[PDB]
Amino acid sequence: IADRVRTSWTYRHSRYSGGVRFSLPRFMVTKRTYLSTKFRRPSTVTKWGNPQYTLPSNVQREMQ
Amino acid sequence: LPNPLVHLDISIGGRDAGRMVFQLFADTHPITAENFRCLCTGETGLGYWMRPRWYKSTPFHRIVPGFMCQGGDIHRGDGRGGECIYGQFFRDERFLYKHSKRGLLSMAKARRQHTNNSQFFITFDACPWLDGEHVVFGQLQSGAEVLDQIEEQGTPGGWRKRPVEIWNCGELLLERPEKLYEPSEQVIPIPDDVYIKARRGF
Amino acid sequence: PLQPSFTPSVAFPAHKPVPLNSPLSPSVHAAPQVRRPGSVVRMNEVIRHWWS
Amino acid sequence: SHVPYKVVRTPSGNLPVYSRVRKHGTEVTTIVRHAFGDITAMKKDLVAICEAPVRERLGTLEVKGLHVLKIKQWLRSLG
Amino acid sequence: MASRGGTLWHLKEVVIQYSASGNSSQGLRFFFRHLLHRWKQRNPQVQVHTVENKYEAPKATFKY
Amino acid sequence: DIFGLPLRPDILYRCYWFYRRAIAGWTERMQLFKWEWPGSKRKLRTQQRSG
Amino acid sequence: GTQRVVQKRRHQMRILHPAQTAYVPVEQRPPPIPHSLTASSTVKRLLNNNTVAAKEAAKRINWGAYISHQRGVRWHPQGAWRVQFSRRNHERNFFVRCECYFRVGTYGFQMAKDLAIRYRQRLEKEWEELQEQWTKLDILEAEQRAKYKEKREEHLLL
Amino acid sequence: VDPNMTVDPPAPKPDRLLDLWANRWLYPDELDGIKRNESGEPVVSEIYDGREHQKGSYQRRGLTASYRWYPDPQSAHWRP
Amino acid sequence: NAERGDADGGTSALRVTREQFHDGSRGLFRPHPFNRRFARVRKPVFPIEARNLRLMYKRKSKRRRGRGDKSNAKGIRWKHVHQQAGRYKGPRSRTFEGGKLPLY
Amino acid sequence: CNPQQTRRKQQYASIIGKQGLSKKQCGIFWDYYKRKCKKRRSTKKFI
RNA sequence: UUUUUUUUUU
RNA sequence: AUUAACAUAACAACAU
RNA sequence: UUGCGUACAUUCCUUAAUAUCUGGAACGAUAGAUUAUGAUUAGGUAGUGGAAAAAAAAAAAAAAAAAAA
RNA sequence: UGAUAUAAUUAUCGUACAAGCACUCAGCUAGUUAUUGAGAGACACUCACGAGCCCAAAA
């Protein structure tokens, strides 16, 4: 809760402890099974995730 | 009190060029003025490196015709050096004056913000684009024939044709450029002296 | 908008007090009110003050 | 009255205010009990008066430092 | 996202499974009354469907 | 003074739990010790001539 | 049973007691000094040092300039005026947290103050207006709902 | 690439300052509740013009015409 | 008095009904706090039940020794390495001082 | 204190959230599932 | 039945 | 009827 | 003479602070949506402290919730 | 094909390394407990009442 941990004498009660802040980046990681990419990447995708081709342009056009 | 009047003797290729005289703006730039005057007079002793903080026998590492000429390095004399009386670096000052005159003095800066040192440079022509980036604290009063000769030793690449070094320094014992804005009084709740006193126990 | 099909309903501003005369005033100086099982005062204050 | 809060006296006829000493005589504070009404304003008043911080416990009002006398006399004026 | 000059979207269908009695679905329930209608209008290019399930935790599935 | 008091769940917590714990009584859940089992006391493998 | 004896101190044949003060009624209470001032070092040392030089410097120091007669405007040890305006709205999904700062080195001691004041004043009104619009929006929504229900009943009647 | 290009205009003046600190821009429907004077400008403008308070503030939110950095002499932002 | 609506778009003396709670039929949906179903916060306060009672303060948790290295438990190494293994951790006395005579 | 408990919990969790499960279907969890269903049916009981 | 019970008080 | 360790088989691969 | 290679930016983006003193004794409040130039920060054995989780069992609160059916 | 890299664990001043255990997997297995204790300048949570608090065993 709150923005930060209050260390002031005003806030030293047992009622001020606990809780967790919301975080989008962290929510898609916490409590989620991990999946490896090895032996899973298609031929249509480059190393950096960019689209990849599997046919000459000439052929592509002809069969389009 | 009257402003300081420092002088510099330049030697081009081992030949006595002349003697230039500058006037420092102590009134407006006390700290800045003080720094330069102490370095010129050499009344502070050694430094970090056990070296004397004196401009005597220092080369000019940069001479660009029509733009400016840099110098003041005491450590190496190449450019990658400098040391103020206060230490390594000192905080900047209010940008009051512009760069619209020939012979104006101003401190140098490093990649960082607050990197002011002994390193200064004399402007050869108006430099509007330099406004706000540098602090102006001095003005040439006499000896433009020496600056004219010095300008001849520069190149577009910042090269030097002949050696240029300061022979002798010292202080003489006996119109201003444009302004960026209009200074006005301010409310000073905490006295200045208090800041000093705080650092010693009180 | 000027002439709706019904009388709109809106509560008192939560960022302001309430008249004492109103039955919904949890203030100590509130006027007497004859209530019955099921009567609840403005919870804005009550929830904030769960012990007083 | 001009106060949004009131204080209830003890059966014996005493104000609900006491002291508190903890950590081998190194944390001395005051305790206020039996507080009704608008306590948010009360805390402001207290802090203002005492020139000391105020903590809001679970059914009790603590104030830093010993201000028992001050509190008592303040309360008596209000009635 | 935008593609080909903003004439092509990726997101197609969104299915949301919630419950009408579970406490954990309170947020979803709330959402379904205040922001659902408001959200839908802004994104007419995306189909939204809801599925009621009593004895099952809520979730959401996305189709691209 | 009975029906017009502040709502204090904190107190109720304790009050509620009290009765519940009381109701429990005595539980017979018990586990046996090493010595409570029926067995001997002699060793099984002496240190010499057997790694 | 067991006995719990408390320790006591003796001094000049008198039982030493902690410091205590009486109550002094005041008709009007002046504003306090901002706490933020203490976050610096000049005042911190002043306070931590109990000496005649400190006590003399205190007198000279002008404390009245840092006081602001405006909610939401405060002093910062950074040498600025901080503007605070925090509000939440779950119904409309709107949350605002102003963290505006007015630097002294840019404008001045008084200019910054004034500016900050103005900014907070502005924000107040803005918020007010937004609320007033939300009410009419709600009303409109209600009306549309009612008309849709009537149209639905029409089909059942058909 | 047009050699006859002109310098970009200054920073704009938004009508509402709440959007600067809010988590989302106000919708058109919500913007309808904006009070205006006879001149057509917001009435609120009298209190405060709404000028930039810090260097590189509006640029962070993307209210600027274009993005610029230190290398660009036209730029104005905090530098370490 | 205190019953007008004072709407935007100039001035309008539109009468309104002041109700703390509503069904949304004529305005904004304002459910009562007397229902966990309709609650926005996981941990309500007002609704009284056998399943809602709270301490209003965090409670200390258990800490078992010898449960992972990363755990916030007490020391485990010191107890084993740098310590007397005698089942007493010293003489079976109450006034022991290390050879020297006790205080008394 | 082992991999086995994780498999049992995962299995359990996969069937708990359903209705109309037979005895032959439930398996070892039949008792648990019956208790769950009876517990659930408690809310529908009136005076 | 156990513990506590001001050293101040015009 | 039944998890792992362990045992065998089928399919999948070409900038070689 | 004039040169050049090189280890480490919290410039950019995303997190964290529990032995009374980081602004915060601020703001908000129907129970906190994470501060955009914000200061100090975040290597660690022994020892000490804070916090989040561990699919289960019990409880006589698993239908006042848009649209659709 | 190019570049780069000294299984893990405990003790120890010492990554100590040619020292001690382990082929692999399955099941079991090592800080348990205050009707009797506690805040003691190396760290001590919280509720009620208040110059007053608790009430033991029968019931």
Written in H, E and C, the secondary structure of A22-38 is CCHHHHCCCCCCCCCCC
- Bridge partners of D27, per DSSP, are D22
Nearest neighbour of I26 by CB, restricted to G132, G133, G142:
G142
Question: Phi/psi of residue B142, each to 5°?
Answer: -160, 165
Q: Please tell me which residue of chain E has the smallest CA distance to J43.
A: E21
D66 near G20, Cβ under 8 Å?
yes
Residues of I in contact with G145 (CB under 8 A): 24
Cβ of residue D57 near strand N, that is under 7 Å?
yes
Both tokens of B127, joined, read: 């430099």
Shortest distance between the Cα of F44 and any Cα of chain I, in A, equals 26
Q: Taking the CA atoms of chain D, what radius of gyration do you get in angstroms?
A: 12
Largest CA distance in chain J: 47
H63 near H20, Cβ under 8 Å?
no
Candidates J17, J43, J14, J15; CA nearest to E55 is J17
Distance CA F48, CA F51 (A): 8
Distance CA H49, CA H33 (A): 19
Distance CA G55, CA H10 (A): 51
H26 near H18, Cβ under 8 Å?
yes
The strand pair at G10-11 and G14-15 is best described as antiparallel
- For the range H21-24, what are the long-range contacts, defined as Cβ-Cβ under 8 Å and sequence gap of 24 or more? H21/G85, H21/G96, H21/G97, H21/G98, H21/G99, H21/G100, H22/G94, H22/G95, H22/G96, H23/G94, H23/G95, H23/G96, H24/G93, H24/G94
Instruction: List bases, strand K, within 7 Å of protein CB.
Output: 2-8
Cα I88 to Cα B149, H2, I83, I85, I94: the distances in Å are 95, 91, 11, 8, 12
Distance CA F19, CA F13 (A): 11
Neighbours of G1 (CB within 10 A): 3
B9 near B166, Cβ under 8 Å?
yes
Instruction: List bases, strand N, within 7 Å of protein CB.
Output: 10-12, 26-32, 38-41, 44-52
* Subunits with 3+ C-beta pairs closer than 8 A to E: G, I, J
Both tokens of G49, joined, read: 């040092």
The strand pair at I29-30 and I22-23 is best described as antiparallel
Cα B164 to Cα B60, B69, B78, H28: the distances in Å are 6, 11, 12, 69
Both tokens of I55, joined, read: 């301490």
**Chain E contact for G93, CB < 8 A?**
yes
G117 near G75, Cβ under 8 Å?
no
Distance CA H65, CA H56 (A): 13
Nearest protein residue by Cα to C1' of nucleotide M68? E50
The alpha-helical segments, DSSP class H, found in J1-47 are 3-16, 23-26, 30-40
Between J3-16 and J30-40, two packed helices, what is the crossing angle to 10 degrees?
40
Cα F41 to Cα F35, F37, F38, F46, F49: the distances in Å are 9, 11, 10, 14, 22
Beta strands in B2-102 (DSSP E): 5-12, 15-16, 20-24, 62-64, 68-71
Question: Phi/psi of residue G80, each to 5°?
Answer: -150, 165
Write the DSSP string, chain G. ----PPP--EETTEE-----------SSPPPPPPGGGGGSSHHHHHHH--SHHHHHHHHHS--TTS---STTEEEETTTEEEEEEEEEETTTTEEEEEEEEEETTTT-HHHHHHHHHHHHHHHHHHHHHHHHHHHHHHHHHHHHHHHHHHHHHHHHH-
Both tokens of G66, joined, read: 């840092």
- Bridge partners of B116, per DSSP, are B90
Cα B117 to Cα B97, B110, H79: the distances in Å are 19, 9, 20
- Bridge partners of B170, per DSSP, are B7
G40 near G8, Cβ under 8 Å?
no
Q: Collapsing DSSP states into helix, strand and coil, what is residue F2? A: coil
**Chain G contact for C3, CB < 8 A?**
no
Distance CA G73, CA G66 (A): 11
Residues 39-58 on E with a CB inside 8 Å of J are 55-57
- Whether C contacts D, i.e. 3 or more CB pairs less than 8 A apart, is yes
Q: How far is the CA of I74 from the C1' of N12 (A)?
A: 23
Distance CA I28, CA I21 (A): 9
Cβ of residue I38 near strand M, that is under 7 Å?
yes
Residues of B in contact with G42 (CB under 8 A): 190, 194-195, 198
Q: How was this structure determined?
A: cryo-EM
Candidates G136, C16, G137, H32; CA nearest to I5 is G136
Candidates B134, B145, B114; CA nearest to B70 is B134
Helix (H) or strand (E) holding D22: strand D17-22
**Chain F contact for C6, CB < 8 A?**
no
> Positive or negative CA dihedral for B121, B125, B130, B133?
positive
> Do I37 and E26 count as a contact with CB atoms less than 8 A apart?
yes
Distance CA J17, CA H52 (A): 57
Candidates B66, B83, B62, B87; CA nearest to B74 is B83
Helix (H) or strand (E) holding I22: strand I22-23
I36 near I44, Cβ under 8 Å?
yes
Instruction: Say which residue the tokens 């208090």 belong to.
Output: B194
Residues of B in contact with H79 (CB under 8 A): 113
Distance CA H22, CA E15 (A): 30
Both tokens of G99, joined, read: 């963290």
Candidates G137, G142, G131, G136; CA nearest to G88 is G131
> Positive or negative CA dihedral for A30, A32, A33, A37?
negative
Largest CA distance in chain A: 78
Both tokens of B180, joined, read: 């960026």
Distance CA B56, CA B166 (A): 6
DSSP state of B147: H
Task: Find the distance separating the first CA and the last CA of chain D, reported in whole Å.
Answer: 10
With left for phi above 0 and alpha for psi between -120 and 50, is residue B72 left, alpha or beta? left
Residues of G in contact with I25 (CB under 8 A): 142, 146
Instruction: Say which residue the tokens 């001849």 belong to.
Output: B152
Cα D46 to Cα B103, D5, D42, D71: the distances in Å are 66, 12, 6, 8
Contacts of B190 (CB under 8 A, 6+ apart): G42, G61, G62
Mark J7-45 as b/e (b = at least 16 C-beta within 10 Å): eeeeebeeeeeeeebeeeebeebeeebeeeeeeeeeeee
D3 near D78, Cβ under 8 Å?
yes
With left for phi above 0 and alpha for psi between -120 and 50, is residue H23 left, alpha or beta? alpha
The strand pair at B62-64 and B68-71 is best described as antiparallel
B64 near B156, Cβ under 8 Å?
yes
Cα G69 to Cα A34, B8, B64, G136: the distances in Å are 57, 56, 56, 35
Beta strands in B44-194 (DSSP E): 62-64, 68-71, 105-107, 120-123, 136-142, 164-171
With left for phi above 0 and alpha for psi between -120 and 50, is residue A41 left, alpha or beta? beta
Distance from CA of residue A16 to its chain's centroid? 31
Write the DSSP string, B49-62. TS-----SS-B--E
Shortest distance between the Cα of C3 and any Cα of chain D, in A, equals 41
Residues of I in contact with A13 (CB under 8 A): 57
Question: Phi/psi of residue G139, each to 5°?
Answer: -55, -50
Distance CA I57, CA F9 (A): 12
D10 near D25, Cβ under 8 Å?
no
Q: How far is the CA of F51 from the C1' of L8 (A)?
A: 38
Distance CA I28, CA G135 (A): 9
Largest CA distance in chain C: 45
Cβ of residue J20 near strand N, that is under 7 Å?
no
With left for phi above 0 and alpha for psi between -120 and 50, is residue J9 left, alpha or beta? alpha
Distance from CA of residue F27 to its chain's centroid? 8
B54 near B74, Cβ under 8 Å?
yes
Strand order in the sheet with G73-76: G73-76, G80-89, G94-103
Between D68-78 and D39-50, two packed helices, what is the crossing angle to 10 degrees?
130
Specify the length of chain D in residues. Answer: 79
Contacts of I51 (CB under 8 A, 6+ apart): none
Candidates B18, B19, B23; CA nearest to B6 is B23
Write the DSSP string, B96-118. -B-S-STT-EEE---SSSS-B-S
* Subunits with 3+ C-beta pairs closer than 8 A to G: B, C, D, E, H, I
